Design a protein around this ligand. Structure first.
Ligand SMILES: Nc1ncnc2c1ncn2[C@@H]1O[C@H](CSCC[C@H](N)C(=O)O)[C@@H](O)[C@H]1O
Ligand SMILES: Nc1ncnc2c1ncn2[C@@H]1O[C@H](CSCC[C@H](N)C(=O)O)[C@@H](O)[C@H]1O
Lengths: 208, 212
């Protein structure tokens, strides 16, 4: 049996690469994006009622995932290389209009094709008795060079995004060598940082 | 300007107590007797693909609504079964597994459901404590259930024959109130059984008969 699916829309995302995408995205509220809905579902009628829903599940295609074991069985993990290649994420819904959802705390790559939107239903989706021994790091302290703080603010005004907060929230989640400069792309920016101490990240510069 | 298309195929099929949509409990995880298996098709029937699930109590299943608009109120504000791309998402309790079989508890899946994916439930990522949903179906309040001596005898006899908790499943689905009328007869199919009941009072279900 084969079943054909097609995207209802595509993600526009802060994240351009898989590296600094936080392992706990709901602790990164500055990780924002939009879901641009495709012409059939771009009518506000398809969204009515979501004004009373804070979080939504997105089923999507791992389009940048280019598999039965993972060095752990594939079905015991959330690996991106898996049969049928469908991902599942719960993100916070900040608002919506005809043909667009505003999202926060996302873990989705830019351009991600979305297959479905489901409202998060707490009594059904939040399993209090759930345990998982296979499944997080506490988080590293983040410090700013004075130059980078000014640059994050300027680009935050230009992009109308919480750039400084996003940089801090992704670096704090431990995306190892002293002296070496590291980098990541966020929106249209290149962010550089280093490890002055093994337990401290310092943001060097924000360019774009 | 052309629509992207992606082909998916089942990794396996669900074998389920439930044969019809009626009386499937609204809160399936409070119905541990709602049991079923996922029969995995090759090459996904190898024990290697399951290693580690011994440490995971609950799993997500992505599946096809194989038993078949935007108005439903909006389709994306609901968990309706008729939806674009026709993919369902349920979290079930994982009781155990072997090569090519998962034992599931608290399912809400129809028999024969084609499953597309298995994901481990990850509490820090999947359990949103601050989540709110006003448009959701409120969890069922609960109705009282009483048994005819005949129906309880048959339910336990069929429970031994089927080697399933038939009586427990009956009680757990009826206690969540499938939904009036007083002289009308209602039923639900469980495995190969037909269970019959009625409402002697508006707040009381009486199980009448179990046939099969
Ligand atoms: N469109 C995409 N294609 C491939 N990988 C993606 C992707 N979008 C996000 N990812 C990856 O998904 C990784 C975390 S897991 C995200 C998938 C989903 N949360 C699930 O549990 O199924 C992210 O860190 C990122 O590396
Ligand atoms: N295989 C199937 N095909 C069509 N409907 C199904 C089905 N399996 C279960 N259902 C229906 O799905 C209802 C549960 S709600 C929808 C399924 C899933 N929990 C989700 O949230 O996406 C069941 O009570 C039954 O009415």
């Amino acid at each position: 049996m084969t079943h054909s699916v097609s995207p209802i829309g595509y993600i526009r995302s802060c994240f351009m690469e898989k590296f600094a995408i936080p392992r706990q995205p709901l602790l990164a509220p500055a990780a924002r994006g939009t879901l641009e809905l495709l012409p059939p579902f771009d009518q506000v009628e398809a969204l009515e009622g979501l004004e009373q829903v804070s979080h939504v599940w997105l089923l999507f295609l791992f389009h940048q995932a280019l598999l039965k074991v993972r060095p752990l069985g594939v079905f015991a993990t959330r690996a991106t290389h898996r049969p049928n290649g469908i991902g599942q994420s719960v993100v916070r819904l900040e608002g919506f209009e005809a043909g667009r959802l505003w999202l926060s705390g996302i873990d989705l790559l830019d351009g991600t094709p979305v297959l479905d939107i489901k409202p998060y239903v707490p009594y059904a989706d939040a399993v209090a008795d759930a345990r998982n021994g296979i499944a997080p790091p506490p988080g590293i302290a983040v410090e700013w060079s004075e130059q980078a703080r000014r640059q994050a603010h300027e680009h935050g005004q230009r992009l109308r995004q919480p750039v400084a907060e996003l940089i801090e929230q992704c670096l704090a989640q431990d995306p190892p060598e002293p002296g070496r400069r590291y980098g990541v792309r966020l929106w249209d920016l290149d962010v550089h940082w280093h490890y002055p101490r093994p337990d401290l990240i310092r943001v060097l510069d924000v360019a774009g």
